[PDB]
Amino acid sequence: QALLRQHPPPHQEFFSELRECAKAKGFFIDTRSNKTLADSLDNANDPHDPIVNRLLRSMATQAMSNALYFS
RNA sequence: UUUUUUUUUUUUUUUUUUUUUUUUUUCUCCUCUUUUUUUUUUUU
Numbered sequence: 001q002a003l004l005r006q007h008p009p010p011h012q013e014f015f016s017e018l019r020e021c022a023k024a025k026g027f028f029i030d031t032r033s034n035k036t037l038a039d040s041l042d043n044a045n046d047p048h049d050p051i052v053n054r055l056l057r058s059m060a061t062q063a064m065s066n067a068l069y070f071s
Numbered sequence: 072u073u074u075u076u077u078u079u080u081u082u083u084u085u086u087u088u089u090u091u092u093u094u095u096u097u098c099u100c101c102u103c104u105u106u107u108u109u110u111u112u113u114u115u
Binding site: 005006007061062064065066067068 | 109110112
């Protein structure tokens with residue numbers, strides 16, 4: 001008896017096009033664990049432009065799952 | 072030195088009654104365009 005709030009893990013297909021655009025300028029990423037997701041993200045810092053990180057994490061933010069309650 | 076007579080304003084009053092807003096038409100009718108639909112997160 002309580003009410004908790006989950007974010008069940010994602011699946012590859014919202015990452016697929018992400019990788020596509022990731023596979024266009026340089027960066028290699030992989031999708032196996034939120035640890036290595038966040039690590040292989042936060043390093044990639046394109047030198048001569050600022051938008052890249054925002055934009056990439058924003059397509060990343062178009063990927064994932066939902067947060068809903070359950071007993 | 073000029074007398075006498077020729078009516079006038081219809082009579083009547085001491086009759087019963089048990090309903091009810093309105094009211095009566097007008098036909099079938101091509102909604103144009105990046106999408107699957109995004110989604111955690113924190114500050115109200």
